[model samples]
Structure formats: structure tokens, C-alpha cells
Target: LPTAQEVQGLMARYIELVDVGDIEAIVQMYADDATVEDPFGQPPIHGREQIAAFYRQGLGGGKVRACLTGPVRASHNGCGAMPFRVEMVWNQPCALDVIDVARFDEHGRIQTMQAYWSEVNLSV
Candidate 1:
């Protein structure tokens, strides 16, 4: 099990990866059989392979970008929320504030990241 600080640092790197919009590199921080439920309620993506494909499209250049939007709130149990904004077209409603409630594995890799956000949350 990783210390909370370790997970926090990993979350910091997560924000770094978000900026590049390179989901391939992003998934590298995940366990080989990790899962992701981006934006939640869509479909819980399972496995790093399928998760890679999902973000390959999700984060693939459509003017997709992210900026640091909030601080990491971590727990000793290896969970926390990392925040950022999703800019799809660099315009109103297209940019949404997001938070990924992440869970880390014993290897300090993301086991799952369930994103929480909507189009209406960007105004702040």
C-alpha cells in the first residue's frame, strides 16, 4: 500500500499528463488491468487496453486540453480527487471543470479513476 503522499504526488503527475492530452502516456500510470469511468454513468471501462482506446478518442486532439483547476484531496486509504478543466473547443460550455475520484493500487498506479463533471460545471 502506498502512503497518501505518494498517491498525492502521483495525482500531481496526473495533472501533468492531462495537459499533454496524451492518453497513452496517461494510462501508463495505471495498473495493467486498470479501469476508468470517465464522466461516470457512461460506461465503466475495464482493463488498461480498453481504457487506452477510450482515452485515445476522448483525449485525442479535438482541441482537447486541461488546466490545473483544484488541489488534490487524498486519504490514507489510497483514494482522492484530482481536479482540472476539460477544454474541447476552447469556448463556453465546451470547457468543463472536472474531478477524478481516483483509487490507487499497491503499486502506486491508478486502479480506477471515476471522473465527475458535466457541461454546466465550468462557469466557476
Candidate 2:
């Protein structure tokens, strides 16, 4: 299991990678069989290639901006959560408030990531 500080470090780095739209760097943080469920309700994507595709579609355009809204919260276990805001253009300028929880593997790579948000969290 990862230490609490390690979990927090990973969470902070996750958002930093997102801010630069660094899809590959973000993907590298995940375990080989990691899963991602952005927005919580949709079907999760799995593995490196699929995860890469997911981020490419979301952040590859380099038009998105992301920033943490609060400090990352780390659990005693290998997990951490963070609140952040993402600004992008869907049709017009929009922003979404998101909280993402990441579970790390013993090796300290993210094993699963569940992002929490919905239309109620979006603004134009």
C-alpha cells in the first residue's frame, strides 16, 4: 500500500498532468490494468491503450484548462480524492466541478479512478 503522502503526491501530479493536457504522462501513472470511470455513471474504460484514447479525446485538443479547487485528501489506505475545476469549450466556454477518487496499487500506480460530476456540476 502506498503511504498517505504518496497518495496525495500522486493526486497532485494527476491534476498537474491534466493542466498540461499530457495524456501520456497521465496514462503512465496508471497501473497496467487500471480502470477509469469519469463522471461516475458511464462505463469504465480499461487498460493502457483504451485509457490513452479516452484522454486523447478529452484533452488532446489542448483547449482545456484544469486546476485544483482544494487540497487532495489522502486516506490511510492507498487512496486519495481531490476537488478540481475543468474549463473547456463544448459549444461555448464551459466549466465543470469534479471530484476524483483514485485507488493506488501497492506499487503506487493508480489502479482505479472514479471521477464524480454531472450536468448539475457544469456551467456555461
Candidate 3:
């Protein structure tokens, strides 16, 4: 399991990669059998392959930009949460205020990612 500090560092690195649209590197941050849930309520996507596809569709065009809105909050365990903003062209120029929580595996790879957001958090 990763320490709180290590989890925080990984969270920061993940946001940086998102900003640059580094899909492959971003995917590499996850474990082979990772899961992702965007918006909290949706069905979680499982495995690296499905996770890769999800990111490619969202970040592939390189038109999206992400920045941390605040410092990452790491738990005593292998989990961290971050608040961030994402600006992208979704039919029109738009932005979303999001908070994502990720739990890491023993090897420090993200085992599960749960993104918290909704249409209410989006703006044009």
C-alpha cells in the first residue's frame, strides 16, 4: 500500500498528465484490473482496456485542459481525492468542476477511481 504522501504525489502527477492529454501514460497509472466510475452513479468501467477506451474518447482530441482547483487530500490509507476543473469542447466550449477520489493498490497503481460530477457542475 502507498503512503499518504505517495498517494498525493500520484494524484498530482495524474492531473498533470490529464492536462497534457497523455492518454497512454494516464492509463499506465492504473492497475491491470482497475475500475473507473465517472460521475459516481454510472456503471463503473472495468479493466485497463475499457479504462483506456474511456479516456481515449474524452481526452484523445487534445482539446481538453485540466487543472487542479485545490491541493489533493490523501487519506491515511492508499486513497486520495482532488478537486479540479476541466475545460473542453463538448458541442460547445464548456467546463466542469469535479472531484475525483482514487484508491491505490499495494504496488501504488490506482485500483479504483471515482469521479464526482454531474450536469449541475457543468457550464458553457
**Best-fitting candidate, scored by lDDT:** 3
For candidate 3, lDDT tens digit of each residue in 3-53? 989988999999999999888999999999999999899999999999999
- How should the candidates be ordered by TM-score, best one leading? 3, 2, 1
What CA RMSD would you report for each candidate? 2.4, 0.8, 0.8
- Runs of candidate 3 exceeding 4 Å displacement: none
Model 3 error, position 78 (Å): 0.5
TM-score of each: 0.86, 0.96, 0.97
lDDT of 2 by residue, 49-95 (tens): 99999999998765899999999999998998999999999879999
Q: Which candidate is the best by TM-score?
A: 3
Model 2 pairs in collision? none
lDDT score, residue 102, model 3? Answer: 96
Better of 1 and 3 by TM-score: 3
lDDT by residue for model 1 over 1-124, one digit each (tens)?
6787887888888877877776878889999988888778788888888988887877775656677676788899989887787677543437788888999988888998999986678652
The local lDDT score (0 to 100) that residue 59 gets in candidate 1 is: 73
